[PDB]
Design a protein that fits this description.
Elements lengths: L1 H12 L6 H11 L4 H24 L2 E2 L6 H8 L13 E5 L2 E9 L3 H16 L2 H5 L4 E9 L9 H14 L3
Parallel strand pairs: 3-4
Antiparallel strand pairs: 1-2, 2-3
Helix pairs in contact: 1-7, 2-3, 3-7
The structure holds magnesium ion (2 copies).
One magnesium ion binds next to strand 3.
Protein name: RNA-directed RNA polymerase L
Organism: Lassa virus (strain Mouse/Sierra Leone/Josiah/1976) (LASV)
Family: Belongs to the Bunyavirales RNA polymerase family.
């Protein structure tokens, strides 16, 4: 067990990052001593890895500060009307074109389909209001079927997950 905890911490500690958000999430994981907390913070780390991958792949800034769409636009210099409250995973403003990105994982096709529609509708509900201030929205929905990512190798991903779940048991 102490050996297993040392293993997953060794695996994660070697994951090199370039931003305060992923750095902070590593710290959150590496200080935990209780299995449920190690599991929760480890799984949260993998989820952030997926967001960062999705942002990189789609040319978006990662929304690491949980900005709403109003804040995203304001930070760029743009005033908004009243909007539904939406905190996307990534964004990019190029001229008057705003990309908003949401990513998720669903391993079952029916669930994938439903979640895809839910996330699409969450962003689409912004379109008309954004158009009223001459912003054209492109909603990007990056649905995945797994937690495999380009941030850590798949074998590390599996080993980390397998070992964290095994710690809940003793
Ligand atoms: Mg999010
Ligand atoms: Mg998401």
């Amino acid at each position: 067990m102490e050996e297993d905890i040392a293993c997953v911490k060794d695996l994660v500690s070697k994951y090199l990052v370039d931003n305060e958000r992923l750095s902070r999430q590593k710290l959150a994981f590496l200080v935990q001593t209780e299995p449920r907390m190690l599991l929760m913070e480890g799984l949260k780390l993998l989820s952030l890895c997926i967001e960062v991958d999705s942002c990189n792949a789609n040319g978006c800034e990662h929304n690491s500060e949980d900005k709403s769409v109003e804040r995203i636009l304001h930070d760029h210099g743009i005033l908004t009307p009243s909007l539904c409250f939406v905190v996307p995973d990534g964004y990019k403003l190029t001229g008057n074109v705003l990309i908003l990105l949401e990513c998720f994982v669903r391993s079952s096709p029916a669930n994938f389909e439903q979640k895809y529609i839910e996330d699409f509708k969450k962003l689409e509900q912004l379109k008309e209001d954004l158009k009223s201030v001459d912003i054209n929205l492109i909603p990007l929905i990056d649905g995945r079927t797994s937690f495999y990512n380009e941030q850590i190798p798949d074998w590390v991903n599996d080993k980390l997950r397998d070992t964290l779940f095994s710690l809940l048991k003793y």
